[PDB]
Each structure stands twice: as structure tokens, then as C-alpha cells.
Design a protein around this ligand. Sequence first.
Ligand SMILES: *[C@@H]1O[C@H](CO)[C@@H](O)[C@H](O)[C@H]1NC(C)=O
Ligand SMILES: *[C@@H]1O[C@H](CO)[C@@H](O)[C@H](O)[C@H]1NC(C)=O
Ligand SMILES: *[C@@H]1O[C@H](CO)[C@@H](O)[C@H](O)[C@H]1NC(C)=O
Ligand SMILES: *[C@@H]1O[C@H](CO)[C@@H](O)[C@H](O)[C@H]1NC(C)=O
Ligand SMILES: *[C@@H]1O[C@H](CO)[C@@H](O)[C@H](O)[C@H]1NC(C)=O
Ligand SMILES: *[C@@H]1O[C@H](CO)[C@@H](O)[C@H](O)[C@H]1NC(C)=O
Lengths: 49, 147, 323, 231, 405
Amino acid sequence: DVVNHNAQALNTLVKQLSSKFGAISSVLNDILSRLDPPEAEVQIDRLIT
Amino acid sequence: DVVNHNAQALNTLVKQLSSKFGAISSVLNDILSRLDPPEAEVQIDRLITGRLQSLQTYVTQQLIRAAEIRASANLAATKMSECVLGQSKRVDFCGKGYHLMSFPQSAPHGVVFLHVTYVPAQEKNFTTAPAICHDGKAHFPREGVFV
Amino acid sequence: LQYGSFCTQLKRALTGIAVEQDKNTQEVFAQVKQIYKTPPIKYFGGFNFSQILPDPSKPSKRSPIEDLLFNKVTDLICAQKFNGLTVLPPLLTDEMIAQYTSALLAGTITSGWTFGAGPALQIPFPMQMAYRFNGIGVTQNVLYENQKLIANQFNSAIGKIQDSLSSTPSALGKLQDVVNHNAQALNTLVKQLSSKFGAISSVLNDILSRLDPPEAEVQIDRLITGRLQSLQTYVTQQLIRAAEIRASANLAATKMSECVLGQSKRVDFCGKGYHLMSFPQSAPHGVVFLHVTYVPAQEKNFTTAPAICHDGKAHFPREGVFV
Amino acid sequence: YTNSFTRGVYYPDKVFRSSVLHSTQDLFLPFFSNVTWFHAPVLPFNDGVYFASTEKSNIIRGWIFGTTLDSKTQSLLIVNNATNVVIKVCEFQFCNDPFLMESEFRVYSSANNCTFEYVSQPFLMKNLREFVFKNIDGYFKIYSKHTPIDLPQGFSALEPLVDLPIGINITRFQTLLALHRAAYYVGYLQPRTFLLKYNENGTITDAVDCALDPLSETKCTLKSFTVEKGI
Amino acid sequence: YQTSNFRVQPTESIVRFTNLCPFDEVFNATRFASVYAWNRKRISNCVADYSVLYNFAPFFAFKCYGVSPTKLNDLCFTNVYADSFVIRGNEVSQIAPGQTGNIADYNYKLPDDFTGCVIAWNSNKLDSKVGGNYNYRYRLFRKSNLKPFERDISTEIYQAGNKPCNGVAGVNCYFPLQSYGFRPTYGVGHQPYRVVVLSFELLHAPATVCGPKKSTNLVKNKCVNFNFNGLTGTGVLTESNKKFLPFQQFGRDIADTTDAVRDPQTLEILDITPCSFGGVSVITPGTNTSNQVAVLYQGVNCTEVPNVFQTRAGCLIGAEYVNNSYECDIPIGAGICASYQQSIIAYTMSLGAENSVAYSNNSIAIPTNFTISVTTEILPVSMTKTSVDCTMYICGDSTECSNLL
Ligand SMILES: *[C@@H]1O[C@H](CO)[C@@H](O)[C@H](O)[C@H]1NC(C)=O
Ligand SMILES: *[C@@H]1O[C@H](CO)[C@@H](O)[C@H](O)[C@H]1NC(C)=O
Ligand SMILES: *[C@@H]1O[C@H](CO)[C@@H](O)[C@H](O)[C@H]1NC(C)=O
Ligand SMILES: *[C@@H]1O[C@H](CO)[C@@H](O)[C@H](O)[C@H]1NC(C)=O
Ligand SMILES: *[C@@H]1O[C@H](CO)[C@@H](O)[C@H](O)[C@H]1NC(C)=O
Ligand SMILES: *[C@@H]1O[C@H](CO)[C@@H](O)[C@H](O)[C@H]1NC(C)=O
């Protein structure tokens, strides 16, 4: 389990990158395109937090 | 102290639900009624973040306390194996003095050890020597001391 | 005010850590009931303890080795003070700790292992050393017939310790690392106050004097959130580090009980070799043990047998070996 | 051609600091750089200019900064006449090879509206004169330093001298003396990150580039001028 | 017990800070440039009031972003810019930081991080010709988007198709610069407006444009609020021996906290130090035993507080020091403890009773009897086991927030 408990943990980390966290999308480029620079900042801050 | 700490933590967790976390109100239905669906989301998300953060802190503190309790339990098991099931020579491990025996008793969430030890008393002064010369030979005590 | 009760929890956690720190020191040093004193005449059969006994001339009343240790281990303070961070003094001063260690040394020199189990009973020091030789499996006459050689070896070995510490500067790395870790954490905390966290500025006065209250509130919120996060992180790291120091202090207390107040049969617990005795010394935020052990040398080859046959009977050695 | 060892360091901000290691990001002259030892043609103005000279008797007087150096486009001029600093910004038409009891003085081809004519105490006056010129944020900033002693291998920061809110665009520049082709160096500035040491007083005793070589990067990361054995 | 903090309070106010600064000629200008070529004027080195220009009251819209309009007279700025032009009221919404607009993209771009104020007043009578004023003209097309705070004057023929014209114009080639339809018949939104924006900076340079405030005399050695040139703060102001160079204005420690300042009126350097403060602890025996207390001011000199004993831990009030020595009862710190003996006393704790052993060359001590003793030891073994329902705790019974979760 010492092995397992590590291999599991990293997996969840790399999965949290696919979570929207209350933004329109989880993809930075997709948000950067479809929105104006003043608007994109709040979405980016949500993702960053 | 263990009971007091756990009760305090649970009470703090419960009381944290009545804090607004920078929203108009803490009651969900008030936000549901007082606002349109498009607007309610931000106000709701504030509460979500606050309550999630409080839960995370509670769990982390519990992990640290559990590690401390595990250390204590390992010490207790070692004392059970070495003071009760045997006779120890380690100084001050099983009571104060020369260890003779121990008796366990159960208590809520823990254990009590009764250590039975031997203590010298009523000492007296004597003159001593390292060895005895007799017939041109040096004599040493087999197990004791010359007085 | 309407952000929770986080301040109370943080204050309580820090208070608990602070109290645990004094309990740690009490466990290690306050192990003796009475304050023992050494006799005016310092003759112990040729053994010389001048390097570890208190020095009357110096005002601190510390032994030479303790002076070297204190010199070896070493305004930003005002900036931290001006932002609500304070450092509390420890309960036991350095003189009290040095007095405790001098009491332990006097007790073990004049009484053997007796003072740790009851009343202290006196015994001549070479006779105590003969008991300790019996403790590891050597007979008494080995000590009594080599007293001068053994005393000279002990004196030379004690003499080399001061040089060994003085030359090498990396010996005391553990004690220094503790201090550096604490100072680094405090420094990061105080330096974190200059982050915008998305606001227009990182000064409360500017935001207040520049905006109306309805627009100032949203700017205040960001700063509050960021600073609260920083405090929480700091407290969590302190809790973990204190959990580590407690384990170290428990180990030190056990070593004081078993190596100084007695003679230990556990292999490699009190030094390398067959344990004879140990002496404590105090250092800033820690303790230093000197372990005195016995090491065999100059071996030789022999032919051996398990038993001896005589008159149709088998003989076995009572406590030795046939060569 | 020659090498700028450790030169072109100035005070980035007008605030006091003492006994402190401070890290900044700014336009700078990278250490051990290729600089041109002119011994005499327009010279480009890219982001900034580091000028140094050791000439005596004030042979060199001033400089000309302009986007296109035509009467149609605004330009700059600076003159040091051993009496005062005559700065001007007016649309001039320049000679092909401009220069200066020579009772008569040369006149430029044309003049126009003069937007700013600051005048003050003259700049100039075995010794080295170093000047850093930068033009950003609608401001033209000038630094200077004069040191008694070939670029010597040492450290001497430059104190700010003036800032002009002219807010124009410059691309090219030249110097003002008899150019019938006097020894002066020219170097250029680039974005860099530096680590500066302030002593007990306000002086900058030493500095370190953060991208010269891996050892310098280590010195940056550790934030010290000494490194112990390790990885 | 630790209860609260103590803080010294300020007793006064100190402020430090001439020719008037003209705006009327800027606002009351005979003619205003076009939108595509917008006039810009630099304002500096003059004290100005924003209320006198707020007395004319021709304005229709006031929008301050970085600052609040009410506090404008209270702030000191540097490098003031005023950008002025004329445009009809139809496009007023197009001028805002990070705002999409035809003139915003193609005539005058405002950065989204703008710090300043935008105002516009309707001088319809003065600026609308009855026969049509086509002098004001705006660019309509260009190959690329305009950068913020950039003015473009070159108006070439714009190719609007495959057809190469090169001064031919016609179809697929329209000249960008086009004039307004200035009809007095045209209603609100199509009548002229004189629009000016004011751009400032905050704290990157020493102050030049200060508002209408009056300075006072300075004080020393007293905790007092100070407002040096807009630098607000609180503390004791002391003389300074810092070697400030003539261009240097402030100072700063390792923690980036202001440590000195120069008076705007008198050129001299002053140090700053916040007034004293600290924590407060209350020492009490049991409530049932008595009701007296003692108070400890942690890390504070006794001279700075409104029996008094000084300790390396702080100032102690309400306890009498004694020369005896006992075992510790209530730990104060640094070797000092406190106890109750119809009064509260403080003393230095004692390590223990003193004993001397009779060491000798040939003397031994042997026990002649013994004692059997029993001792207790208590060890916790387990904890309480708890479980939680995440969704029910966070969200309760609302299904809306479950999806958010
Ligand atoms: C042994 O003799 C010394 C000599 O003064 C005395 O102090 C000590 O009390 C004696 N021991 C006992 C147990 O009486
Ligand atoms: C014992 O004998 C062996 C073989 O003769 C030799 O290798 C070894 O060194 C000897 N031991 C000693 C202590 O001389
Ligand atoms: C500087 O540049 C010139 C031309 O690019 C070159 O010849 C010279 O070697 C360079 N100096 C160096 C590399 O030190
Ligand atoms: C810094 O100033 C002090 C002021 O007395 C002076 O003694 C010292 O030499 C100065 N150090 C320099 C200029 O490096
Ligand atoms: C501050 O306390 C010290 C002793 O700690 C004392 O000598 C001094 O007079 C006190 N007051 C001042 C102003 O330093
Ligand atoms: C023990 O013997 C030594 C040398 O024989 C002597 O110097 C010392 O005084 C003696 N201790 C006594 C008499 O207590």
C-alpha cells in the first residue's frame, strides 16, 4: 500500500486539471479566445485559485 | 483532554455554518428567493468555498491529532510487553526504583499501569578497601564488597 | 468580524505549541530531586574532570565545553515586531539549566548509579569503575591492575573532544537548522504582506482614501482572503514541526534516564562499543551527550575445543573458554 | 571593438536603502559585453545607449536624437557651452555632417516651434565621463557619472541627473563634434535582472547579473554573494 | 490568561505640502480637435481645485474609475494628462477602459487599466452649425487596430476590396476620414459634446500636482497622524541622520516599510516609528479563593504605561517582589513565578533543596533496610471515531448548489 497510496495521489492531482472550478471552461486557450481581455481575468483567477 | 478537544472541534465545525462569508445571507433559501437564478450563483459559490475550507481545516487537524495518539498507543503497547510480561532493567521505564512487577487496569480510552518497585533505606557508613593482601597474595571478593 | 472564528483557533493553536515547548525542557533536565554539589578537593583516583565541571572564574558558571558550544551556535526583529509578531521568553533561564546539569554530574561522580533510584550512596570512584567493568564481562583485577593506564587514556580522550568540536564547524548543524527554519518561516510571513492579491494596491490606507466605501469593500475583501490564507499555512507548518521536536525531546529524555542514570546493555544506544558511562552538557535549544565506552584491541589466534575429556568424563568451562 | 567588464549600473529608483541585497528588473548593460570604440554615419537607438569618453578640453559637446532627423519631424538637441546646458526640442533640418574664437557658430538648416527649452548648470567638468540615456514611458531619463582613473575594471554606479517629459519617439542619434571621417565608446541596453548590494550608506558597492552564467543564477536563487559546497 | 492588546493612540494631526493651476483655458477652449486627431495637454507643476471646474456644471456624465470623484481635491497627483475632443452623444458609451467601439478600436483606444476620470458636456448651441459643421471628421477604416493612447494623423485611401485603386477610389476604395452630419434638427445623441478625459498616476514619482489643502507645523516625539504629500501614516516622527542623497525621498527597511521621509516645505529628513503596543495577560488565583489580580504588559518598558515591577518578560503591576525562593506556582517567565500568600507576590523559582555528599577515598554507604512502593501511570490509547456527509453539510437540501458542488 505504500506504493499504492502514492500512485493514487498523483492521479487525483492530474485529474484536477480537468475541473472547471466554477468557470466556463477548463481550457485556458478556449477561454482566451471566446472572451474579451477584461472579462477573461476573472475566469483565469478562478482557475488559478 | 482528549474528550475536551474532540468536543471543541465538533462544536466549532457546527458553529461555523452561521457565518455569511461575505454574502448577503447565510440561509440558502433567502438567496434562492431574493435573487434571480443568474445572480444567485456567485452568492452561492461564496458559501460553498467558505464551508469547504472549514471542512478541510477540520480534517487536517484531526490527522495530526491521530498521529499523536498513535505514538502514545505504541508506547503503551511496549510497556505492556516489557513491564507486565517480563521484568525490566531499563532505568525509569517501569516506575521509579528497581522494577519488580506491574499490573494493568483499563480506563475510558486508555490504560493505567501500577508499578511495584524496591527502594533502599536506612543506610550506614563503613570503611572499605579494594583488595586484601594475605600470604603475599591479593584477594578479591567474588560477588560482594569488603567492609 | 463576519468571516468566522478563525482568529480564536489560530491563537489557541499557538498557545498550545508554546506550552509544549516548556514541557519539553522540563522532561529532559528536571530529572533530579536535589541539587548535589561536588567536594572541595577534586581528586578521583587520577581521573580529571576539569573540562566538564563548572568554572568558578567565569561569571556564567559554565564549563569550558559549554562555553565553546554557546559561542558556536548563534534590524529584522523590529520589522517583525511592528506587525504583530512577538517572541516569548522561555521559562527556565540558561543558568538554571546549567545548574541542573552540574547537579547531575556531581551526583554521578560521587554516587555512581545510586542517586537515580533512591538516596545517594557514596563510593570511591575507582571502585565504581570496577563495578562498571563487571557490568560488561571483565573481572575487577583488570581495572585495579591497570588504573594508571586507564586514567591516562580517559584524560587524553576527553582532551581531544574540544579540538574536535572547535575545528569542524558542521558538527552543530541540527541546532542551527532549527533556528534557521524558524527565522525563515517568520521572514516569509512578514514579507507576504506586500502582495496585491488582485487588488489595486497593497496598502489599506490608499484604498480607503482613494475610493468610496461601496467600491472599497470589494478591494478589502481580496486582501483579507489572501492574508488569512497565509496565516493558516504558517500555523499548519508550525504544528507539524512541533510534532517532530516532541519526538526528539522524548528520545533525549529516555537517553538521559538510561545512559546517565545507569549502565545500558542495549547495543549502540549509548555510543559505539561496550557502554561504561555518559555525561550531559547543555547547549542552546538542545543537549549534548559524551559517551565513554570500552573497545577491545590487539587480538590473537588460538586453537579451541568445546569440552575436555578426562577419566571418561566430559568437562565444560564454568565461565570461560578453552584455548 | 572592446569589452565592457562591469559598467553601466545606475540607481533604478529614488528611494533610500542600506545594508541590503535588492533584486531588480530593468534595462541594463550586460556584463562582459561587446562595445564599439569609435575613433572617428548614423548610429541606431534601440532601447537605450551607454556612452563613455575620456577626452579632455571638451571636444565633444552634445548629441542629436531623432526618429528621422528632418525638419518635418520633431527632434532633440543638447549643447554644453561650458556655461549652461541648452536642451531644446524643435523640428530642425540638420546638416549632413553637423558640428561646431570661431566667432561664428554653425547654424542648422531650419528651425520650428520649440516645445521645451530647459537650461541649467553644464554637465561636463585621466577621467571618465559615463552617461546612460533611456527613453520610455513618455519620459527621457539621463544618468551620469564622472570618475578619475580604457575602461577600468571596477564598480561605480551612476546617479540620476534629469528627466524630461517630452514624450516623443526616437530611433536614431549622433554626436556633436567635428566628424570629418575624439575616441568614445558606445554600448546598448537590454532587459535584465540584477542583484545589487547596498552598504551601510546609500552606495551600491557591487552587483550581479542573473543570466551571465549558471553560477550567477545560483547566486541569484540563494540571494547571496557566496555559495557553500553542494548541489 | 491572555486577554487582549494595548495600543497607544495618536493625539494630533500633521500635514505638509502657491501658484494656481489653470483649467478654464483647457475646458473653455474655442475649438476642439477631431476624434481621429485628439488634442492632448500636459498639466503639472501647479496646484488646482477640482471643485471650481465642478461649479460650471455643464456636465452630462462623470465617470471616475481609479479614484472617487468626492476625494479628488484630497489627492496629490503627478503627470496629469488631459485628452480633449468633440463627439456627438451617440458614441459616449464607446469610451471606457476595455470597451468595444468603432472609435475605440479605430480612432482612440483606452487601456482597460485606465486610472482617471472621463467627462463630457453638451455644448450643442456653440458647436452645432445650423447649416452643417463638417469640419469635425473621424477615421472609419484602417488596416490594423489602434494601440492604447496612440494618435494617428495619416489618412490615406483605404482599399475596401480586391480592386487596386492607388488614388482612384470608387468602388471597393473608400477614404476613411468622414464628417459628421451636424444638423440642429438632429436630436439627443447627434448633437455635439465636448469630451475630455483626465489621466493620472499614483505613487511612482515625487508629487507635483497637489490639491487645495493647507499645511500645519510639524511636531516630534508624539504619536501623531501625518499626511506628508499624500503619504498617510501614524507614529512618532524623529530627527533623522540618514545620508539621503538629493534625489532620494523615502527610505525602507528589509521588510519594505517606510523608515524616513522629507518634509515638502523644509528640506530635512525625519525617521518614523510606530508608537508602543503589546499583549496583556491577567494573573489570578482561583475565583473561589479571592478576586484580586495582577496584570502583565508583555515586552513593554514600564515607563510607557499610564506596585510596578520590571521583568525581562514585561511590566508587572499588582504584585510585590520578594527575596525568598519557592517552587513555581504560576509561571510568569524568565525564571519568575507568582503566587498568593492575602496578597499576590512574585519571586524567583528554586530548583530544589541543596545536598552535599560525603565523598572520600575509602568510605562507603550500605543500606540496611528496604521499602516496597507502588506508582501509577496513565496513557491514552484511542480517540473518537467520526464520519461526515459532505453534501449534506455544505449544501443541505438544495439541489441547485449540488450541481455547483
Ligand atoms: C558518614 O560520615 C559523614 C562524615 O561527616 C557524615 O556526614 C554522614 O552523615 C555519614 N553517613 C551517615 C549515613 O550517617
Ligand atoms: C589468524 O590466522 C589467519 C591464518 O593464518 C590469519 O589470516 C590471521 O591474520 C590470524 N589472526 C591474527 C590476529 O593474527
Ligand atoms: C564584437 O563583435 C565583432 C563583430 O561582430 C567581432 O569581430 C568581435 O570579435 C566581437 N568581440 C568579442 C566577441 O569579444
Ligand atoms: C558611510 O558614512 C560614514 C559616515 O560617518 C563614513 O564614516 C563611512 O566611511 C561611509 N562609507 C562609505 C562612504 O563607504
Ligand atoms: C527601558 O528599559 C530599560 C531596561 O530594560 C531601562 O534601562 C530604560 O531606562 C527604559 N527606558 C528607556 C527609555 O529606555
Ligand atoms: C585521597 O588520596 C589522595 C592521594 O593519596 C589525597 O591527595 C587526598 O587528599 C585523599 N582524600 C582525602 C584524604 O579525603
